[PDB]
């Protein structure tokens, strides 16, 4: 039966032994492939379960009605038959995992206390213990198998129904926030988890109740205190979890703000370095980091108070019960005490899994509510009426429709067209053509009139849908491939030029791409698809919205007039050009019919259409270096030693408390003789000993000591790990990524913004948690083995082969698990891609007929994703069962060891060995899983560490005054692999002289500005300012003088005062004087807080002119002797332009002025004009002389610019 699951018997299904061959193949080969994973096993396909659920829901709706219908009843009825069997198996395992400690151990200890010699009794008891262990383990395996299969079935069915519903929506208004995910995406994983890890809820209370009753039976009124301890304990941990969640949410808000600021200042680095403004941003980031650190610290304390639930509770309950029981006058023995302790050690198993069940159930309930909210919407309704006459295609007779908002836009619409007729519709903006287009497709609701439609539609929207596939099939849209049709379509739409542009051929994709395409080409492929589809009636809505006249004419005369001569065409557009050739024109205005007839008749009528026409014509290897780096960053070996010492001290304290309990009992009476009864005798009772308060005092002291040590350990570990994480990344990374050069160009800025947002989370939140859990588990295992082997020295024989077996099995398990995970991870993505591409643009999908193709593709991709999930879960259960077998063997060995030696060991030590052997169950799986999880988190540190690893000449400040600018053959190159931009450039500028820069783009205009600031080192020559070489002056000293106004005005978040002067080097009087000169003082004065008013990002509070005026203000604040102006007139109005020229000439008239712009009039008034071409200086003369020379290129450019106005 194909899949092996359907052929296995009961024994193979109970042990998961049908998966064994895959492990052997994975070991032999090295990696797996999708060719031999498996297929799907039937009984889990989408169609069968979808039909079943649909039938159930329809029956429910018919039975009750759409007011009180519930999805919970339907889901329960769907999953009713198997949950009962799962519950029965769980009850059997919980009942059989308690009969061991309560009945088997007590009889064994009581036998040890007796004075006989038998082997049959002890052998029978050993047999009983082993059999109970086996039964418990195998029952648990069966429960898990059943639950996994049921969950997979339910998830598939619900997801397929959810995506089936969406394709028939006629009120699409919710954004792609619910539809894309919460209905057909990972939202079904919650419904899977509710049946996989949900349920299992009646597992804790039952065993807890049974244990409480048994304890009261054994001891009684003094045995009635363990219940009190447990009840008073657990709600405290609930409260601690709530507080941790609250603090975590607040920290999330703060770090979101920090990363927002980091993104804001990551790409302005030229602006920052041009003024040497690196001080402020460091301060701001440091403050935000401090606040985040404090909140994280508090959350860490409250989260770490929790991880020690079980042994602490056991010790507390035992101490209280036994102390109160003894300090009243009573009797105790080894059997009772150690039976009670062993029972206390088995109550705390299902209380390790109840909370996950509760939270999973809550999430599932919310998801079901959302699904039921979706399932009630308006369906589709397609018109099936046929025209009375065969010559009629569309029919309209006094039909009125209202758009559902119900808003009327159409009123008494009547028209009639026939096959082979071209009809054009004209109207203004908002006339109501779109309402008619929406009504003819049947989307609009019907209120009055009759509708008749025959034919097939071909719809071209004003926007291209663009489908994630190859060009050939995208044009094909699921049609048979041909040759003459294909080339006729290409020639008709003149797509051949575009084919040569494509790198490879017409086989690439039109998805995200790297070059995208133009709107006109998208329109061209849209009409290509439409006219290749070969439908009956064509609906064309303004396909030529943004095209040139020529291509419109060729497209028209090639396709519309020839191909669709006999095909009905409906044309809706605003332009009145092609309407000459149309055989019918209908004018729509104010939702009523105005004109009807041919074009010539329309001109004959001479109505509003004539007026409008006239107006228009007018891998994960992770070597040890990572661990070494983390340890070195944490502080050194001393921190490691301190933390390990504290862990060992805590666990040793717990072990000492239990040992003292064992040591008190052995000292029976103390060779004390009493005269009770009628004759003297030596008592054997523990109460008779005169010294009893000693031992109770030492008990209380032990409890207090253990509590104090646990608190100290938690605090110290949290603080140390937080310091280790906070130093490395931020301190040694932000200080380095603020002084590279050119590194910012040949590297995307979207992958340096990352590693500041995700890696910080991975290093701050999860690593300490996982490390703490792992270390605690390992140390506990070591202590348990040592404590057992201390009493019986021969126990260190059955530990060797078990270690060898564990080492053999672990590697195979790890390889199989990794390989199975990778396949699911790789195969996830096309599912999501198809879902997104289908959700975007439902109109065209519903336009022709296509629903079945998309549904089939969805189902196929669903199954291909589903299979490896099931395989992965089965592998995990396989490993768990093997480890359980090892533990059972160890327990049986120690029990037999106790039995075989009798009469030479006191009963108390035998009880202690038994009490410590039971604790070993269910630890190895936890240890292995936690080791893998904490290994997977040590990858971020590697990337961060990799990215981290990869004079004098101070003269007097006489720079001002005679500020001469001289160039002597300056050469520079942007990169070492590119041609030199500047080639022997030399010029001298006199002080207080105005110079303009003109030339074509790419000829080296920006090179002068880049090299004047020494941002890129020159390759030859030298530049001297005021007789001082710029190479001998420090970068900080040189940049503090010159100023440049950028072509685009940018502003940062904060107050106006910070945006004007962050260094607080100026008082208010100069700021007001500067603001008054640019006539913006009144605007700031009108602000309620003036200079304290808050400024949003990008300066959205102000208009463009205000931003530019603020830029000139901050330029005027510095009072520089040398100024560079760079294209201040990009898209700014003429009034503001004359304003800025007036302000510049009134303010910058006492300093050297250099201008680089595309407007000749800006540099017309300059003393001299510079012309550059191909990196060489061409012309250097006054404007009067340059204009007088015809051969000058500047004069030719001026004539060409002037001809654009005089001629036109």
What are the counts of helices (DSSP H) followed by strands (DSSP E) for the chain? 47, 26
20-29 vs 852-900: helix axis angle to the nearest 10? 100
Contact status, residue 382 vs residue 223, Cβ threshold 8 Å: no
Method: cryo-EM
Q: Is residue 1031 annotated as involved in ligand binding?
A: no
Q: Is residue 1002 annotated as involved in ligand binding?
A: yes
**Measured distance CA(1158)–CA(1000) in Å, rounded:** 9
Dihedral sign (CA 573, 575, 577, 579): positive
Tell me the three-class secondary structure of 931-949, residue by residue.
HHHHHHCCCHHHHHHHHHH
309-326 vs 637-666: helix axis angle to the nearest 10? 30
Burial class (CB in 10 A: 0-12, 13-18, 19+), 334: buried
Contact status, residue 957 vs residue 1121, Cβ threshold 8 Å: no
Query: What resolution (Å)?
Result: 3.4
120-166 vs 354-374: helix axis angle to the nearest 10? 20
Length of the chain in terms of residues written: 1208
| In 400-462, beta strands by DSSP E | 401-403, 407-408, 413-418, 422-426, 445-446, 450-453, 457-460
- Provide the residue range defining the domain that includes 1122: 992-1007+1033-1206
Q: What number of other Cβ atoms are within 10 A of residue 565's Cβ? A: 10
Contact status, residue 201 vs residue 348, Cβ threshold 8 Å: no
Q: Is residue 800 annotated as involved in ligand binding?
A: no
Query: Two tokens at 156?
Result: 């598939």
What is the residue-wise DSSP string for 1141-1197? HHHHHHHSTTSEEEEE-S-HHHHHTSSEEEEEETTEEEEEE-HHHHHH-TTSHHHHH
Chain-centre distance of CA 247, in angstroms? 21
In a domain, 472, yes or no: no
Burial class (CB in 10 A: 0-12, 13-18, 19+), 786: exposed
Name 847's Cβ contacts closer than 8 Å, sequence gap at least 6. 441, 457, 458, 459
The two beta strands, 422-426 and 584-589, are: parallel
Residue 401, beta-bridge partner list: 446
Q: What number of other Cβ atoms are within 10 A of residue 360's Cβ? A: 20
Phi, psi of 258 (to 5 degrees): -60, -45
| Residue indicated by tokens 């102390």 | 323
**Measured distance CA(734)–CA(431) in Å, rounded:** 59
Q: Is residue 1027 annotated as involved in ligand binding?
A: no
The two beta strands, 445-446 and 450-453, are: unpaired
Q: In b/e form, how buried is each residue of 245-273, taking b as 16+ CB within 10 angstroms?
A: eebbeebeebbeebbebbeebeeeeeeeb
In a domain, 1152, yes or no: yes
Q: Is residue 1020 annotated as involved in ligand binding?
A: no
Contact status, residue 541 vs residue 462, Cβ threshold 8 Å: yes
Q: Is residue 428 annotated as involved in ligand binding?
A: yes
**Measured distance CA(815)–CA(27) in Å, rounded:** 7
Phi, psi of 399 (to 5 degrees): -105, 130
Count of the separate structural domains present in the chain: 1
Contact status, residue 1080 vs residue 1109, Cβ threshold 8 Å: yes
Breaks in the chain (C–N beyond 2.5 Å) sit after: 405, 618, 950
Phi, psi of 1044 (to 5 degrees): -140, 135
Q: Is residue 1004 annotated as involved in ligand binding?
A: yes
| Residue indicated by tokens 């439609």 | 453
C-beta pairs of 796-803 under 8 Å, 24+ apart in sequence:
798/889, 798/890, 798/893, 802/886, 802/889, 802/890
What is the residue-wise DSSP string for 94-142? HHHTTHIIIIIHHHHHHHHHS----SHHHHHHHHHHHHHHHHHHHHHHH
Residue 104 to residues 100, 122, 914, 1013, 1153, Cα–Cα distance (Å) = 5, 10, 11, 88, 100
**Measured distance CA(1050)–CA(524) in Å, rounded:** 39
Listed residue (72, 363, 49, 348) closest to 196, CA to CA: 363
* Termini Cα distance of the chain: 84
**Measured distance CA(664)–CA(1066) in Å, rounded:** 81
The two beta strands, 994-999 and 1020-1025, are: unpaired
**Measured distance CA(865)–CA(873) in Å, rounded:** 14
DSSP 730: I
**Measured distance CA(224)–CA(230) in Å, rounded:** 11
Q: What number of other Cβ atoms are within 10 A of residue 67's Cβ? A: 5
Q: Is residue 429 annotated as involved in ligand binding?
A: yes
In a domain, 936, yes or no: no
Listed residue (132, 347, 335) closest to 912, CA to CA: 335
**Measured distance CA(1165)–CA(898) in Å, rounded:** 109
In a domain, 256, yes or no: no
Q: Is residue 1006 annotated as involved in ligand binding?
A: yes
Contact status, residue 180 vs residue 839, Cβ threshold 8 Å: yes
Q: What number of other Cβ atoms are within 10 A of residue 497's Cβ? A: 8
Identify the helix (H) or strand (E) that includes residue 398.
Answer: strand 392-399
C-beta pairs of 108-115 under 8 Å, 24+ apart in sequence:
108/895, 108/898, 108/899, 108/914, 109/334, 109/335, 109/338, 109/339, 109/907, 109/910, 109/911, 109/914, 110/335, 112/898, 112/902, 112/907, 112/910, 113/333, 113/334, 113/335, 113/907
Q: Is residue 433 annotated as involved in ligand binding?
A: yes
Burial class (CB in 10 A: 0-12, 13-18, 19+), 597: middle
CATH number, residue 1124: 3.40.50.300
**Measured distance CA(993)–CA(90) in Å, rounded:** 94
| Residue indicated by tokens 């390889």 | 815
Among the residues of 401-535, which ranges form H helices?
433-440, 471-476, 484-492, 496-501, 519-533
Q: In b/e form, how buried is each residue of 745-772, taking b as 16+ CB within 10 angstroms?
A: eeeeeeebeeebeebbebbbbebbbbbb
Name 1150's Cβ contacts closer than 8 Å, sequence gap at least 6. 992
Q: What number of other Cβ atoms are within 10 A of residue 77's Cβ? A: 13
Residue 1176, beta-bridge partner list: 1173
Query: Two tokens at 454?
Result: 């025959």
Residue 416, beta-bridge partner list: 395
**Measured distance CA(837)–CA(839) in Å, rounded:** 6
Residue 593 to residues 133, 434, 607, 608, Cα–Cα distance (Å) = 88, 15, 13, 12
Residue 593, beta-bridge partner list: 588
In a domain, 964, yes or no: no
In a domain, 1072, yes or no: yes
Q: Is residue 1005 annotated as involved in ligand binding?
A: yes
**Measured distance CA(574)–CA(462) in Å, rounded:** 13
**Measured distance CA(492)–CA(823) in Å, rounded:** 46
Contact status, residue 1172 vs residue 982, Cβ threshold 8 Å: no
**Measured distance CA(711)–CA(1010) in Å, rounded:** 60
Q: Is residue 1182 annotated as involved in ligand binding?
A: no
Dihedral sign (CA 1055, 1061, 1067, 1070): negative
Listed residue (906, 897, 792, 791) closest to 122, CA to CA: 897
In a domain, 784, yes or no: no
The two beta strands, 1020-1025 and 1028-1029, are: antiparallel
Q: Is residue 427 annotated as involved in ligand binding?
A: yes
DSSP 762: I
The helix, strand and coil proportions of the chain, stated in percent and rounded to the nearest 5, come to 60, 10, 30
**Measured distance CA(937)–CA(942) in Å, rounded:** 10
Burial class (CB in 10 A: 0-12, 13-18, 19+), 1042: buried
In a domain, 789, yes or no: no
Angle at 470 between CA 465 and CA 475, to 5 degrees: 60
Q: In b/e form, how buried is each residue of 392-416, taking b as 16+ CB within 10 angstroms?
A: bbbbbeebbbbbeeeeebbbebebb
Name 622's Cβ contacts closer than 8 Å, sequence gap at least 6. 935, 938, 939, 942
Angle at 912 between CA 911 and CA 917, to 5 degrees: 100
Q: Is residue 1000 annotated as involved in ligand binding?
A: yes
């Amino acid at each position: 039966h194909q899949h092996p699951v359907d052929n296995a018997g009961l024994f193979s299904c109970m042990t998961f032994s049908w998966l064994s061959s895959l492990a052997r193949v994975a070991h032999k080969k090295g990696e797996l492939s999708m060719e031999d994973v498996w297929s799907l096993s039937k009984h889990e396909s989408s169609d069968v379960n979808c039909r079943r659920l649909e039938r159930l829901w329809q029956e429910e709706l018919n039975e009750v009605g759409p007011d009180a219908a519930s999805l919970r009843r339907v889901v329960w009825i769907f999953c009713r038959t198997r949950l009962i069997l799962s519950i029965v198996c769980l009850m059997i395992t919980q009942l059989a995992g308690f009969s061991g400690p309560a009945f088997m151990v007590k009889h064994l200890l009581e036998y040890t206390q007796a004075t006989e010699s038998n082997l049959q009794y002890s052998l029978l008891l050993v047999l009983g213990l082993l059999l109970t262990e086996i039964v418990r383990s195998w029952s648990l395996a069966l429960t898990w198998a059943l639950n996994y299969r049921t969950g997979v079935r339910l998830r598939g069915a619900i997801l397929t129904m959810a995506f089936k519903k969406i394709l028939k929506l006629k009120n699409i208004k919710e954004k792609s926030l619910g539809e894309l995910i919460n209905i057909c995406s990972n939202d079904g994983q919650r419904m899977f988890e509710a049946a996989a890890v949900g349920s299992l809820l009646a597992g804790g209370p039952v065993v807890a109740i049974l244990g409480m009753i048994y304890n009261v039976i054994i001891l009684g009124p003094t045995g009635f205190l363990g219940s009190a301890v447990f009840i008073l304990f657990y709600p405290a941990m609930m409260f601690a979890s709530r507080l941790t969640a609250y603090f975590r949410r607040k920290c999330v808000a703060a770090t979101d703000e920090r990363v927002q600021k980091m993104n804001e200042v990551l790409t302005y680095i030229k602006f920052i370095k041009m003024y040497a403004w690196v001080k402020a941003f460091s301060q701001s980031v440091q403050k935000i980091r401090e606040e985040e650190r404090r909140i994280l610290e508090k959350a860490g304390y409250f989260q770490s108070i929790t991880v020690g639930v079980a042994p602490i509770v056991v010790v507390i309950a035992s101490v209280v019960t036994f102390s109160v029981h003894m300090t009243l006058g009573f009797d105790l023995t080894a059997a009772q005490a150690f039976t009670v302790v062993t029972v206390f050690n088995s109550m705390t198993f299902a209380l390790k899994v109840t909370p996950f069940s509760v939270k999973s159930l809550s999430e599932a309930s919310v998801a079901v509510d959302r699904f039921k909210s979706l399932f009630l919407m308006e369906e589709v309704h397609m018109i099936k009426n046929k025209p009375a006459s065969p010559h009629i295609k569309i029919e309209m007779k006094n039909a009125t429709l209202a758009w559902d908002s119900l808003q009327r836009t159409l009123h008494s619409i009547d028209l009639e067209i026939q096959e082979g007729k071209l009809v054009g519709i004209c109207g203004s903006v908002g006339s109501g053509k779109t309402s008619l287009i929406s009504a003819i497709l049947g989307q609009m609701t019907l209120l009055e009139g009759s509708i008749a439609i025959s034919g097939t539609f071909a719809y071209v929207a004003q926007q291209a849908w663009i489908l994630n596939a190859t060009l050939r099939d995208n044009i094909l849209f699921g049609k048979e491939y041909d040759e003459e049709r294909y080339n006729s379509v290409l020639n008709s739409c003149c797509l051949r030029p575009d084919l040569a542009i494509l790198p490879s051929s017409d086989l690439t994709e039109i998805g995200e791409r790297g070059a995208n395409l133009s709107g006109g080409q998208r329109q061209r492929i849209s009409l290509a698809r439409a006219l290749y589809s070969d439908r009956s009636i064509y609906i064309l809505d303004d396909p030529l919205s943004a095209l040139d006249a020529h291509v419109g004419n060729h497209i028209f005369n090639s396709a519309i007039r020839k191909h669709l001569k006999s095909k009905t065409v409906l044309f809706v557009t605003h332009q009145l050009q092609y309407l000459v050739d149309c055989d019918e024109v209908i004018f729509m205005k104010e939702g009523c019919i105005t004109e009807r007839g041919t074009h010539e008749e329309l001109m004959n009528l001479n109505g509003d259409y004539a007026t409008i026409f006239n107006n228009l014509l007018l891998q994960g290897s992770v070597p040890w270096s990572v661990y070494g780096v983390y340890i070195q960053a944490a502080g050194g070996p001393l921190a490691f030693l301190v933390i390990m010492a504290l862990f060992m001290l805590n666990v040793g304290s717990t072990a000492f408390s239990t040992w003292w309990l064992s040591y008190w009992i052995k000292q029976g009476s103390g060779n004390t003789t009493v005269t009770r009864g009628n004759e003297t005798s030596v008592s054997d009772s523990m109460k008779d000993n005169p010294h009893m308060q000693y031992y109770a005092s030492i008990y209380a002291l032990s409890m207090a000591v253990m509590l104090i040590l646990k608190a100290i350990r938690g605090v110290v570990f949290v603080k140390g790990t937080l310091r280790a994480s906070s130093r490395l990344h931020d301190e040694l990374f932000r200080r380095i990524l603020r002084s590279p050069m050119k590194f910012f160009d040949t590297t995307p800025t979207g992958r340096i913004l990352n590693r500041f947002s995700k890696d910080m989370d991975e290093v701050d939140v999860r690593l300490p948690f996982q490390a703490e859990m792992f270390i605690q588990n390992v140390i506990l295992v070591f202590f348990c083995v040592g404590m057992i082997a201390g009493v019986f020295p021969w126990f260190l024989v059955a530990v060797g082969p078990l270690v060898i077996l564990f080492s053999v099995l672990h590697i195979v398990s790890r390889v199989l698990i990794r390989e199975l995970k990778r396949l699911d991870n790789i195969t996830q993505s096309p599912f999501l891609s198809h879902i997104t591409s289908s959700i975007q643009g439902l109109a065209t999908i519903h336009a022709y007929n296509k629903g079945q193709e998309f549904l089939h593709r969805y189902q196929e991709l669903l199954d291909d994703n589903q299979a490896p999930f099931f395989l992965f879960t089965c592998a995990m259960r396989w490993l768990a069962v093997r480890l359980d077998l090892i533990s059972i063997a160890l327990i049986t060995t120690t029990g037999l060891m106790i039995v075989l030696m009798h009469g030479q060991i006191p009963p108390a030590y035998a009880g202690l060995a038994i009490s410590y052997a039971v604790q070993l169950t269910g630890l190895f799986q936890f240890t292995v899983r936690l080791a893998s999880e904490t290994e997977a988190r040590f990858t971020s540190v590697e990337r961060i560490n990799h990215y981290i690893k990869t004079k004098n000449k101070a003269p007097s400040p006489d720079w001002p005054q005679e500020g001469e600018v001289t160039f002597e053959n300056a050469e520079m190159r942007y990169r070492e692999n590119l041609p030199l931009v500047l080639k022997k450039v030399s010029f001298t500028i006199k002080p207080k002289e105005k110079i303009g820069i003109v030339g074509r783009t790419g000829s080296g205009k920006s090179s002068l500005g880049m090299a004047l600031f020494r941002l890129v080192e020159l390759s030859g020559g030298c530049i001297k300012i005021d007789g001082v070489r710029i190479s001998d002056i420090g970068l900080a000293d040189l940049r503090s003088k010159l100023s440049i106004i950028p072509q685009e005005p940018v502003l940062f978040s904060g107050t106006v005062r910070s945006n004007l002067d962050p260094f607080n080097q100026y008082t208010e009087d100069q700021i007001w004087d500067a603001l008054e000169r640019t006539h913006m003082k009144e605007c700031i004065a009108q602000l309620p807080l003036k200079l304290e008013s808050e400024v949003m990002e990008n300066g959205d509070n102000f208009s463009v002119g205000e931003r530019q005026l603020l830029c000139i203000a901050r330029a005027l604040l510095r009072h520089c002797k040398i100024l560079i102006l760079d294209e201040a007139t990009a898209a700014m109005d003429t009034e503001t332009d004359l304003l800025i020229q007036e302000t510049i000439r009134e303010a910058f008239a006492d300093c050297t002025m250099l201008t680089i712009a595309h407007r000749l009039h800006t540099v017309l008034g300059s003393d001299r004009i510079m012309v550059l071409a191909q990196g060489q200086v061409v012309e250097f003369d006054t404007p009067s002389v340059l204009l007088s020379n015809d051969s000058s290129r500047f004069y030719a450019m001026f004539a060409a610019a002037e001809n654009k106005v005089a001629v036109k």
